[PDB]
Amino acid sequence: GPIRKVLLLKEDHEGLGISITGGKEHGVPILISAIHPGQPADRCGGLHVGDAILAVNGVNLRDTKHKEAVTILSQQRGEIEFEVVYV
């Protein structure tokens, strides 16, 4: 399927506004499980539940364990670019 590049702008006091599940230890990609109303992902648009996150800010998430992805994702700030594909 199509790999979309999706932009999200986040203030430092805000979260991304997504929940993720999956990861290498489960044999699946990092997958979006929820988009939280009113937070940056919802406001900015373009992400959806069931998307596999292939990269964030050019950092590859394809073979990451869940906790690794949580770390990388949580460290991104400001203007953030996701690369995602719906699975």
């Binding site: 997504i18 599940t21 999956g22 489960h26 044999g27 869940h66 906790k67």
Partner: peptide, 10 residues
Amino acid sequence: ANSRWQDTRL
């Protein structure tokens, strides 16, 4: 394949 996956809000 695991039946249980963590789910983390970010």
